[PDB]
């Protein structure tokens, strides 16, 4: 009703450590199929590259590398 | 034999730690002081905690109980 759905849903983190993470990424990680459907139906981008520092492979330094893509995740 | 060696090294570590000045010992505590949660009184539960990292490829679903929702 605020005609802002596209920008809100496809909004993402800004700090370098989680840069690129999108609510679709959180939905897929939380394993909520219903939320995946709900988000994508409302215009969620399915090509969001979660290219943060956390989502890259670094020895010792904590993180999980999955391919930075919702399909890859 | 490996267990004996590890215990020998443990004794060495303890002796070395005990055999230095208080400045370095206080500068060399293990782990970090982290806000684990809340006491039943509701106050903050600060503890000296040691952090490990684990990987499980069978039971990821055990999402119950989590500090720091941000990784």
Swiss-Prot record, chain B:
Subcellular location: Postsynaptic cell membrane; Cell projection, Dendritic spine membrane; Cell membrane
Ranges where the record places region AD: 1-20
Modified residues (Phosphothreonine): 12
Tissue: Widely expressed at low levels. Expression is elevated in dorsal root ganglia. In skin, expressed in cutaneous sensory nerve fibers, mast cells, epidermal keratinocytes, dermal blood vessels, the inner root sheet and the infundibulum of hair follicles, differentiated sebocytes, sweat gland ducts, and the secretory portion of eccrine sweat glands (at protein level).
Domain notes: The association domain (AD) is necessary for self-association.
Function: Non-selective calcium permeant cation channel involved in detection of noxious chemical and thermal stimuli. Seems to mediate proton influx and may be involved in intracellular acidosis in nociceptive neurons. Involved in mediation of inflammatory pain and hyperalgesia. Sensitized by a phosphatidylinositol second messenger system activated by receptor tyrosine kinases, which involves PKC isozymes and PCL. Activated by vanilloids, like capsaicin, and temperatures higher than 42 degrees Celsius.
Subunit comment: Homotetramer. Interacts with PIRT. Interacts with TRPV3 and may also form a heteromeric channel with TRPV3. Interacts with CALM, PRKCM and CSK. Interacts with PRKCG and NTRK1, probably by forming a trimeric complex. Interacts with the Scolopendra mutilans RhTx toxin. Interacts with TMEM100. Interacts with PACS2.
Comment field (misc): Responses evoked by low pH and heat, and capsaicin can be antagonized by capsazepine.
Name used for this protein in its record: Transient receptor potential cation channel subfamily V member 1
Species in which this protein is naturally found: Homo sapiens (Human)
Organism ancestry: Eukaryota, Metazoa, Chordata, Craniata, Vertebrata
From-to range in the entire protein, with total length: 694 to 764 of 839
């Amino acid at each position: 009703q605020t005609d802002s759905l596209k920008e809100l849903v496809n909004a993402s983190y800004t700090d370098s450590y989680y840069k690129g993470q999108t609510a679709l990424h959180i939905a897929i990680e939380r394993r909520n199929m219903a939320l995946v459907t709900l988000l994508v139906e409302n215009g969620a981008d399915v090509q969001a590259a979660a290219h943060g520092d956390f989502f890259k492979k670094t020895k010792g330094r904590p993180g999980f590398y999955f391919g930075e893509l919702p399909l890859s995740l | 034999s490996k267990n004996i060696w590890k215990l020998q090294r443990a004794i060495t570590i303890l002796d070395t730690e005990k055999s230095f000045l208080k400045c370095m010992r206080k500068a060399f505590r293990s782990g970090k002081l982290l806000q684990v949660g809340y006491t039943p009184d509701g106050k903050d539960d600060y503890r000296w905690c040691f952090r490990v990292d684990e990987v499980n490829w069978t039971t990821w679903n055990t999402n119950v109980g989590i500090i720091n929702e941000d990784p």
